[PDB]
Amino acid sequence: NQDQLKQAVAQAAVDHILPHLDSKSIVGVGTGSTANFFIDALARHKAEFDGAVASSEATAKRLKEHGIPVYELNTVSELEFYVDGADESNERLELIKGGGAALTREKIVAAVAKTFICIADASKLVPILGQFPLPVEVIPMARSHVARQLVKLGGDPVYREGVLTDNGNIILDVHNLRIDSPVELEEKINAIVGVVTNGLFAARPADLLLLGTADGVKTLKA
Amino acid sequence: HMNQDQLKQAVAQAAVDHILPHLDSKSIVGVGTGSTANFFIDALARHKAEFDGAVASSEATAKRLKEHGIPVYELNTVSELEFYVDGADESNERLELIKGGGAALTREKIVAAVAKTFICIADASKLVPILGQFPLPVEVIPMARSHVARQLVKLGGDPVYREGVLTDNGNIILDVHNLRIDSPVELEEKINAIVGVVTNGLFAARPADLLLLGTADGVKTLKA
């Protein structure tokens, strides 16, 4: 099932990074269901590295519960690895992220990491991004303005009722985009004043995609 | 001789003079934040019986408006906003601005985006040949501080975290020194490409539409 595919890619990421780790290693860590399997698998090797940088309060809490040191991103200039899930990837390793509402700090940690490993079950690999609605984090008082600007880009935005991110912002999930050019669209959405971050990880895509399939975990590159 | 406050009052009143013939009972005015905007609130409030109310660009401005008896509406309740009136830290001759000295750049930039006509009101000293002597404010997610600073250094700036300041949105500001901003629209876009940036203080892709400049010899009315 899906959970066992998530468990598999989480373990695959641990196995991949393990030989690279040493007492100075600080691992960047995602948020959400797949990342949580990764946290628990990584913790079984906590003696092999220094600590971690979290992409959410929830992730920070889970890491601490395992006795893994959690450091603020502000204390590093680079991380060797950032490991996280996604809602969609295309074959160029351009992603839609933000289902779990943590897209902003995730995108920031990913920017500091040298190698972004995305871990996902097979169903998340799509020919063209956009069937999964694109999350956009928005300053709350900008809701109506940003929605209007997203309509101009050909989307149907929907406010995610009752949700505030770790940063105190709302999310508009944008339906009905056919995202043939994710790098271009990511830039267009960043041109909208009131947008904090958008869920396209395209200008800085994943570097490695570990995909959990019925035939095992496959390693994909752009 | 007019002091800086008096020059600010002159442009505040000039802005009221400009917009008044265009206001009716359903007019909602977008309002900036800071010293010059506050003088504008003083002048505008004398006419509160002639228009509906205002949209604020900060919690401080919302308080000032209410203290003057002007109704305050959330931006989310409007789509039609004819005027936004605010100060700036610098303008060039193309009405491209540096804003954010008063730390309100994000909500200011959002309200300005909704308004049809952005009137910038400023004293003479704020008109400069090239933007950048006034350090450029950039609003940043707090956990992104070191990352964004590194990316701003790559653009030729010297970013300095503004001690003890959190914006209305819970973010920090990096004030970026030493830029000579020859192409404000291009730099604005480049800074927006840095993940961790919330907004930057260049109002260039959406510049001011009208600049009222207070000088010793009267108010100047400038356009790009």
UniProtKB/Swiss-Prot annotation, chain B:
Q: What quaternary arrangement does the UniProt entry report?
A: Homodimer.
Taxonomically, the superkingdom here is: Bacteria
**GO BP field:** D-ribose metabolic process; pentose-phosphate shunt, non-oxidative branch
- Supply one GO molecular-function term: ribose-5-phosphate isomerase activity
User: Which organism is this entry from?
Assistant: Pseudomonas aeruginosa (strain ATCC 15692 / DSM 22644 / CIP 104116 / JCM 14847 / LMG 12228 / 1C / PRS 101 / PAO1)
PANTHER family in alphabetical order? RIBOSE-5-PHOSPHATE ISOMERASE (PTHR11934:SF0)
Locate the residues binding substrate.
T33, G34, S35, T36, D86, G87, A88, D89, K99, G100, G101, G102, K126
Presence of keyword 4Fe-4S: no
Question: So what family is this one in?
Answer: Belongs to the ribose 5-phosphate isomerase family.
What is the protein named? Ribose-5-phosphate isomerase A
Q: List the CDD domains hit by this protein, alphabetically.
A: RPI_A
Q: Which UniProt keywords apply?
A: Isomerase
EC class of the enzyme, as a word: isomerase
Q: Where is the active site?
A: E108
Pathway in which the depicted protein is active: Carbohydrate degradation; pentose phosphate pathway; D-ribose 5-phosphate from D-ribulose 5-phosphate (non-oxidative stage): step 1/1
Could you give one GO CC term from the UniProt record? Answer: cytosol
Instruction: Explain the purpose of this protein.
Output: Catalyzes the reversible conversion of ribose-5-phosphate to ribulose 5-phosphate.
Q: Which reaction does it catalyse?
A: aldehydo-D-ribose 5-phosphate = D-ribulose 5-phosphate
The EC number(s) attached to this protein equal 5.3.1.6
Task: Enumerate the Pfam families for this protein.
Answer: Rib_5-P_isom_A
